[model samples]
Target: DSCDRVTPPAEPLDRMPDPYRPSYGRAETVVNNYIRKWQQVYSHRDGRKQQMTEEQREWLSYGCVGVTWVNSGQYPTNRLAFASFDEDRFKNELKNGRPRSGETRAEFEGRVAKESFDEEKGFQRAREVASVMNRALENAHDESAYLDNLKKELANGNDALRNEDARSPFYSALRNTPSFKERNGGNHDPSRMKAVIYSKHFWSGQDRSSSADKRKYGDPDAFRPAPGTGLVDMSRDRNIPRSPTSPGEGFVNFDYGWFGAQTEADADKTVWTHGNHYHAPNCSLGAMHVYESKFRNWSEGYSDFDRGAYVITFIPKSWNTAPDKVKQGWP
Candidate 1:
């Protein structure tokens, strides 16, 4: 309350907005530095917990969306960003089941193209994600949180692939997967690489609680950003989802809050970033195509989960329609 009465010194502008306006909440650096806690992250799956492999951690870090799926709840995976032809084709198989032996490709896809497909839902979802981001911009008056979120995002891209110059093997190895050949008709391209990863279990939510709250984690706003700030409290609870002892199927917990970046041209649009960067997995940590995949990673649990208490993350491609949105409110 004292801050309200505190004067911010003299300014150069006569009647313009104050450059040194009173600030509030935690410094962005304090929140962003908290990323150190995630240095030892875990992957929880198959009803067990273990340390996430360097590989899994790297892959999971690339996402910007933090779509939350409690238990076995489903979201519009078909639509989010899978504008790629093959990605769509494969998810169709994943969603509608593989085409019959005598079924023509058209015969199957024509049916898959129904009005209620996830693709349509995803398209609507993108709009919703954009809307949430806009609200964030309106409330965000400071730049510290925004910058911190960006620094971490760059780290995520780097973690996804150590060598920025060299292309990621996740894309190359994708073509080798059995389903790539059988279901997707062998369509794979490095340029078209895009995917979304989400936590399958509802282990935590806003304010670091052990369960989801309708106000913070649901209802009116799903995982809303703390108003007037980019950072939001997350669930890295004592529940502590474990990682596997060996390489296997599961989700990696990056422990970073998902924040969005705004491009110069589309500053009004809110594209999500990791740490979930919103509203649970209703949004994803995609680049438009942020993260890359692993060898045989798709087969283990990309689409169909085994219904264990542990959840699985699946990868598919995002289409050209997906934007290469380079900045998220970068100053």
Candidate 2:
């Protein structure tokens, strides 16, 4: 009976007597609880070092889905479920990393705690294995076996290595998958892990004054989603409200799409300078990534403004997939 809203409620105004919905801001509560869910590695006594699962990334994103709706005067009455929790591979570690000849059970239990991977270290291990899986996929003698192994190895995950951005463990595996190029457009490569810097403004379909020039440079849509859903016919990508996240300073072809920052500060700074104080809670389509190799020459100098170039962008929350399809949120 919940998360079943066909339409989110419009912003409450004074015309109605009791328009206030009790569930207005509950999504934020769900988002904040990630702090607790992450702590399970230590408190659960499992000594688990498994990657944060896709369900976890979805959980991380759902709260953000509600915020956008409410901010745009829509009530996000959709229910968020967070009976939060994950599995496997710890037995070997537990079996191997234990006991001295004379150690008592109680003493060993007291002396040893489960090896909790409460951070990026767990995901790094996942990345290494995923990397090896991709290499095999590339040079495979048996395509079916390599792919079968890859499907398991490329399990989607998020690694919040820093407070600013999230990395996907399955990125390489996603690209190496046979259907990736066709499924995701040929032009847009999520593999590049480009950052979409957010501000209050975006370019229109028409280019302006040498910036966001479609004819001259042909910039892509600034708001394009990875899975390509819930798009608005607005907010064209341009260089005017320039971002520090672009790959090659002056050229356009070097970019797969707009790049993202390693830190959230640039995105927030855009809001501060151009949009006015940022307020939306952080949401991830699990889009933040760290492919530094792609942006080796990324520059902070390409701007329309004199020195500290700035622009604005807004979340297109009014699209087809707003809350109904939580995974399809704007980047």
Candidate 3:
């Protein structure tokens, strides 16, 4: 019979080519979306402050996590995630001052056209909160409850993988429920809320002379005098490539000088330089903060050497300008 044997389909009738696999750069898009999500959640709506529910807290926590991955000295990645999270606060908090008045449903519905403007203002306020959180974390000598929030986040996250660096001396203080000593080491006092400018470059096992040295810092044991609080390694932490346009600029401490100028650039080009830098804890002065000039003072003993600071320098006192410095694209 003709139906006894059907011929097999040629070229495999059900065959299909593989769908496109995502590329590396797609992470950038995902990160941007995350930032936008953060902005939206923190934003106010309908004359009411947006509620920060568990999900919202988680969202904010996610942004902080991104900051940790990129900003922490060990795992510094040059992705756009850093800039997206490092927004200015005052500019972003514009909405906080102008609350909306309660209105009828019809009035609110008719005001849909005004939503765009409202959103912009809300974004500013959200940014301010972000800025406050970030500043609090950085300047904090000892880890505060806010930082603890991050530790809690990572501990609970499914993706948090424990490893060498996660347990490294740098993150050692943050491993557990970081206390003032754990977060700031024994040096920084958390309750003070005083800015702690402990550049890792000045502490721990780092090699300041090599390319990698330019990345982090020399060993804490590298302290020539060893561990003595009074006899500290107060040398001008100079991470120098000698000049700008150098491969790394030997990126030393946080660009507080630059950040200061950009943050509050006045009509005059001269920025309030002093208020823009970090103040080293001076036991001699009873932990009294000596501003930029005093803090940046050339160590008479190390006149032969140059500075090797980090990108996380502390903010100075009342500076003429804000910290407005930019490297390539960071805020």
Candidate 4:
């Protein structure tokens, strides 16, 4: 009987499915950095019991959106000159940086055009991640029916990913293990090339005892800017997500919050003059791909977690299709 039945097709064959679908599984993702006691910097010394002050909490909380004090040491006051793609410079350095292939100037221009398109697509994907994360944080806690509803939302998102697999590996990856439910101490250690590393202990929102909250951490109010540094061109209209506060709440500083840059040793060798940057895995494009895979292995515990807001955001109804709608197949 099973073999005789005709298989049915899922609706909307053109759309991709979400791979990081929630299994209604439970797991810790966000970490609260504020400690109860005083400390100069964030480290293991602060321990788990510490609670962050309101200001400090906001600063730490801002990390989810990729905002940090300009630099931990000093806030930058001057605007750094923004770099644009230089066609002349690019041609001269064709053999350097990233290699380019083309026979004529026209061909070179075509290559540049494709690269720009790719970068724009990448920006969209990254912005989608940020938007989803913001929604997740907003609904992090709702102990009542919140967890159950969240599980459904996450499951639906994962189902969406499954549909998207044919178009993008990234979305497909998000539907499977490491994306849905990952345990740091388990068999999903994917830090090859040492490009990334997941912590064994992902933080949770559980409240700690007051005795444990006294450890000191950085002050969010007294956060000062580094000298000679300036604000980034606070263009409200960028690849950043559309939020009520998106335009006004601009880049404050570049402090080394939870994320880290390259090491001095690596920088000295000119590997990455900008140094290494640290960020939570769930928030980055590549890292999210891996994180989603690890998250799906288990399915029972977190079924009710309300992560729909953080997992994805739908396009606004009023706005016209983006210029890139062609890529999505619209006239």
lDDT of 1 by residue, 93-147 (tens): 6477876687555434433332112322222333333333233223333333322
Give the alpha-carbon lDDT of every model. Answer: 0.26, 0.25, 0.26, 0.22
Per-residue C-alpha lDDT of model 4 across residues 46-94, encoded as one tens digit per residue: 1331223344333333332222231121121111111113344434544
Better of 2 and 3 by TM-score: 3
Better of 2 and 4 by lDDT: 2
- Give me the displacement of residue 48 in model 4, in angstroms: 17
The root-mean-square deviation over C-alpha atoms between each candidate and the true structure, in angstroms, is 23.9, 25.6, 28.8, 26.2
Report the error of model 2 at residue 47, Å.
42
Q: Is candidate 3 or candidate 4 better by TM-score?
A: 4
Candidate 4: regions farther than 4 A off:
1-29, 33-51, 65-67, 70-78, 81-86, 89-263, 268-331
Better of 1 and 2 by lDDT: 1
For candidate 3, write residues 1-331 as lDDT tens digits: 3222121112221232222221221111122232332233212333232322333322222222222221121222111011011122322433243334964332332222122122122222223322443444554455555455434533454312122254432233332312223323323443322121211112222344544532332221222211111122334334332223245443223222112223322222221111111211222212111122111221111211222222222222211112233111111
Candidate 2 residue lDDT tens string, 1-331: 3222222122212221211111211111122232222232211212332333334333333332222222222222111100000112333434675667876543333223222211122222322433444443443334345444444433442322112112232223233322234323212232321111211122212344434333232233223222211112222333344333246653211111111122222221111101111122333322222111111122221222211101111112111111111111111
User: Which regions of candidate 2 deviate over 4 angstroms?
Assistant: 1-61, 64-120, 138-331
Candidate 2 contains a number of clashing pairs equal to 11
